[PDB]
């Protein structure tokens, strides 16, 4: 239903696609450099929508191995 590259027609944004390809390069690095690249791979934050002004509802992340390869 979108028209474009293989990530864009699959609903995926370019930022997710380019970070998946960034993730899979890090899993192939040398071990003196693989674990320090695991530092810049981790994702730790949280989000919360504000539909009314003060309400709640969120989505927390304690991800280590990288951005999720599966469907969001």
């Amino acid at each position: 239903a979108p028209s474009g590259p293989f990530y864009r027609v699959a609903g995926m944004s370019y930022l997710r696609y380019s970070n998946i390809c960034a993730d899979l390069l890090r899993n192939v690095l040398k071990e003196p450099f693989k674990a320090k690249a695991q530092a810049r791979q981790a994702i730790h934050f949280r989000q919360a929508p504000y539909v009314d002004g003060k309400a709640g509802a969120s989505k927390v992340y304690e991800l280590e191995n990288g951005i999720p390869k599966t469907a969001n």
């Binding site: 944004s13 930022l15 997710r16 380019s18 970070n19 960034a22 993730d23 530092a39 810049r40 791979q41 981790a42 994702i43 730790h44 934050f45 949280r46 989000q47 919360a48 929508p49 504000y50 539909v51 002004g53 003060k54 927390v60 992340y61 990288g66 951005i67 969001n72």
Partner: protein, 106 residues
């Protein structure tokens, strides 16, 4: 920020928020106000609570990574605006922090 012994840093850019959020509205447009950092939801509601729709916090707890900043950006493209406004303090030296507006057009 997330923790708040900063000394009026989280308020100076909340002040610089409405300084640019009243400036760039010349036609009555939609604006979604987002805050990254837990000290932003407590101060942006004081000015715009009807346009405040997203709250990212717990960002700086381990570190800041590009994959994390990608996911924050993908949640910002769920809404699709025609422009983006990023309001932050540019770390120039240990003394001066001149704030920046960085704009991204769709």
């Amino acid at each position: 920020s997330d923790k708040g012994l900063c000394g009026g840093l989280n308020s100076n850019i909340t002040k610089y928020t409405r300084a640019t959020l009243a400036t760039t509205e010349s036609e009555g447009k939609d604006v979604v106000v987002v805050s990254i950092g837990d000290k932003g939801r407590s101060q942006l509601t004081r000015i715009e609570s009807q346009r405040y729709q997203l709250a990212i916090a717990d960002t700086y707890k381990v570190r800041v990574t590009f994959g994390q900043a990608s996911l924050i950006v993908e949640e910002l493209i769920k809404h699709n605006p025609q422009s983006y406004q990023i309001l932050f303090n540019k770390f120039r030296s240990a003394i001066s922090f001149k704030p920046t507006v960085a704009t991204i057009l769709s």
